[PDB]
C-alpha cells in the first residue's frame, strides 16, 4: 500500500510496524515509524468487531473519543484514531526511554532506597497527569509503575500497554466485584507512592497467595515505611489513599496539592 | 539517560 500525505497520521499506509510492545485482551500495541516525517510512534490496534459485542464496542469508541481529547505534558498524547483493516487503530505518543518499574528494580538491585526528594519529583508529575484525566471525567483503570513512563529528559508520561491473574494492585472494590470508579485510581496511586518508598507493593509477600492477599486487603495490612527516611506527610498520604472505602479516599486534586507542596519544599 | 543521573545524584540509603 502506497503513501498519502493528504491523510497525514490518519491512515496505516503512512506507518511502518517496527516491533510489538504490548498485548491486551482486545488489543496489541506496536512501535512504528511515521513514514511522512520519520518520527516514531506507538500504534494500538483494538479488535472492536472480532473480540467484542455491540455494547463493549460502543463503550470502547466512546472511551477513545474522550481520551483523544486529553492534552497534558504528563499524559501520552493521542495523535489519531481511525477504523481501518477491521480494527480501531490509535496513533499514540511513544515513550521508549524507560519507566518507574525499571527505576524501582534498579535501586532494588543497587540495594538503595529512593530519596524522598526523588519520590516527589516523579510523583508530583503522576498526580498532574491524573488530575487532568479526572477533571475531564476519565478513569485510568490501571495505575502501576510499568505504565508510568519516564522520558530521557526526566519527564513522566502516564500511558497504558498492560494462581493470581488479577490487577497489579488488588483493591477492596475488586474483591467485592463492585466495579472500578475514580476513587479506584486513588487506591492505585497510594499503592504506587508506597512502592516508590518501599521498593515493593504494599501487599507483596515472599510466598504470596489469594487467601493471604484478601485477608491483608480486608485489614489494610502493609508494613509501615521507615520514618527515618520518609516524612510523616508521605506516610499520611499513603495511609489516607490506602483506605477500604472508596468514598473516604481523597480526590486527585487533594493528592496533587499535597505533592506540589511536598515537591516544593523537599527540592 | 535519566536513570544514570538519578542513581548518581541521589543519597545512599541502606536497607535492613
Residue numbers in the entry:
A (entry chain A): 20 to 181, 196 to 300
B (entry chain C): 810 to 825
Paper text:
Nek6, Nek7 and Nek9 contribute to mitotic spindle assembly during early mitosis with the microtubule motor protein Eg5 and heat shock protein Hsp72 as substrates of Nek6, and the centrosome-associated NEDD1 protein a substrate of Nek9. Nek6 and Nek7 are also substrates of Nek9 that are activated through phosphorylation of key residues within their activation loops. Nek6 and Nek7 are closely related proteins that comprises a highly conserved catalytic domain preceded by a short divergent N-terminal extension (NTE) that determines their distinct substrate preference. The non-catalytic CTD of Nek9 provides a second and alternative mechanism of Nek6 and Nek7 activation through binding and allosteric relief of an autoinhibited state31.
Molecular replacement using Nek7WT as a search model revealed two chains of Nek7Y97F in the asymmetric unit. Additional electron density was observed on the surface of Nek7Y97F at the same position on both chains. This was modelled as residues 810–825 (chain C) and 810–818 (chain D) of Nek9, bound to chains A and B of Nek7Y97F, respectively. The crystal structure of the Nek7Y97F–Nek9810–828 complex revealed a binding site on the C-lobe of Nek7Y97F, within a groove formed by the hinge region, αD, αE and β6/β7. In the structure of the complex, residues Nek9 810–818 form an α-helix. A set of hydrophobic residues (Trp811, Leu812 and Leu816) that were shown by co-precipitation assay to be crucial for the interaction are on one face of the helix and fit into the groove on the surface of Nek7, burying their side chains. On closer inspection of the Nek7Y97F–Nek9810–828 crystal structure, it was evident that the two Nek7 molecules present in the asymmetric unit formed a back-to-back dimer conformation centred around residue 97, in which the ATP binding pockets of the protomers face outwards, away from each other. The back-to-back interface is almost exclusively formed from interactions between the N-lobes, involving residues within the NTE (aa 24–29), β2-β3 loop (aa 55–58), αC-helix (aa 81, 84–88), αC-β4 loop (aa 89–92, 96) and β4-strand (aa 97, 98). Chain A of Nek7Y97F bound to Nek9810–828 closely resembles the original Nek7 structure. Phe97 is in the ‘down' position, and thus the αC-helix is stabilized in a similar position to that observed in the original Nek7 structure. In contrast, there are several notable conformational changes in chain B of Nek7Y97F bound to Nek9810–828.
